[PDB]
Design a binder for this molecule. Structure first.
Ligand SMILES: [Ca+2]
Ligand SMILES: [Ca+2]
Ligand SMILES: [Ca+2]
Ligand SMILES: [Ca+2]
Ligand SMILES: [Zn+2]
Length: 316
């Protein structure tokens, strides 16, 4: 909507207070004009119609329980935009400041979130498995990273290319979480997963096997469920990414860590310059090696660590 940029205040899912960029025109809308061509957050009103209604608020104060998922989806979309702009010089998910749109309160008791090809979508969870999923900054950046992938490599959401697609979203979801620097970790969704259980998460990059996901190519899933295990086989790539950044020895293969920033540079370059819709795990290794060669040299430690890491997880 056409209006004037304003700044509201509210509370997120976890109860923290944050300022949000809004737009005033009769009502205060969750429309952030300070980033690209706008970040817009919508109310799906417990329905599955999308996008729903642009979030309208009467007083620019968002402290109601019903406001919390919208506050976080709006705010964490902004943080993710900042990450890609400041760190990778990327303007929104299409590189041309495309408007970013999110809907919260999707359906009833919906234990998931997703990017649907046009926008992010967040359920509220059932209160047992999940609380509203936009409360996890790694979840928000995960979904928005799917948009980035859609507009670059376009990895088909099936089998190994789909598992790469998922891993990419976990990697930068985690790197965004580290970028915001609030309780960062190498686990996915811990901030919104099972409020009754401390310390658990949906997935683990440091130890995917913690939740039954493979940490080595020899344990890859190859049935038909989960579009061929895209959320399962991602553990193989997540583990390799984790090893590249943090280092460690895995199935007897020692990896020298090079840190989060260099991981992000290598994998962003791989994503945006070398990966294609049909890339498999082996081609991802080649993409990452060539990327690290472009950035640091063919004889660099960075290249050697990429090779070590994929060796560790059994990808040649
Ligand atoms: Ca209000
Ligand atoms: Ca965390
Ligand atoms: Ca996390
Ligand atoms: Ca939990
Ligand atoms: Zn995903």
């Amino acid at each position: 909507i056409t209006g004037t940029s304003t700044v509201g205040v509210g509370r997120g899912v976890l109860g923290d207070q944050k300022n949000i960029n809004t737009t005033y025109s009769t009502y205060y809308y969750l429309q952030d004009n300070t980033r690209g061509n706008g970040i817009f957050t919508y109310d799906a009103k417990y329905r599955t119609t999308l996008p729903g209604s642009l979030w309208a608020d009467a007083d620019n104060q968002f402290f109601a329980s019903y406001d919390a998922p919208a506050v976080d989806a709006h705010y964490y979309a902004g943080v993710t935009y900042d990450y890609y702009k400041n760190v990778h010089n990327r303007l929104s998910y299409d590189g041309n400041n495309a408007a970013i749109r999110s809907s919260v309160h999707y359906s009833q008791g919906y234990n998931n979130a997703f990017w649907n090809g046009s926008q992010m979508v967040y359920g509220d969870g059932d209160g047992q498995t999940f609380i509203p999923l936009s409360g996890g900054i790694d979840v928000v950046a995960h979904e928005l990273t799917h948009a980035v992938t859609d507009y670059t490599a376009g990895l088909i959401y099936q089998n190994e290319s789909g598992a790469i697609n998922e891993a990419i979203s976990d990697i930068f979801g985690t790197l965004v979480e580290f970028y915001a620097n609030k309780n960062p970790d190498w686990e996915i969704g811990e901030d919104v997963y099972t409020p009754g259980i401390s310390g658990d998460s949906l997935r683990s990059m440091s130890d995917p096997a913690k939740y039954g996901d493979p940490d080595h190519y020899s344990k890859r899933y190859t049935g038909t469920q989960d579009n061929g295990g895209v959320h399962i086989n991602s553990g193989i790539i997540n583990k390799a990414a984790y090893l590249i950044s943090q280092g460690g020895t895995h199935y007897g293969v020692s990896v020298v860590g090079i840190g989060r920033d260099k991981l992000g540079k290598i994998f962003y370059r791989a994503l945006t310059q070398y990966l294609t819709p049909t890339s498999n795990f082996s081609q991802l290794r080649a993409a990452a090696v060539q990327s690290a060669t472009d950035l640091y040299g063919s004889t660099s430690q960075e290249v050697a660590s990429v090779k070590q890491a994929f060796d560790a997880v059994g990808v040649k």
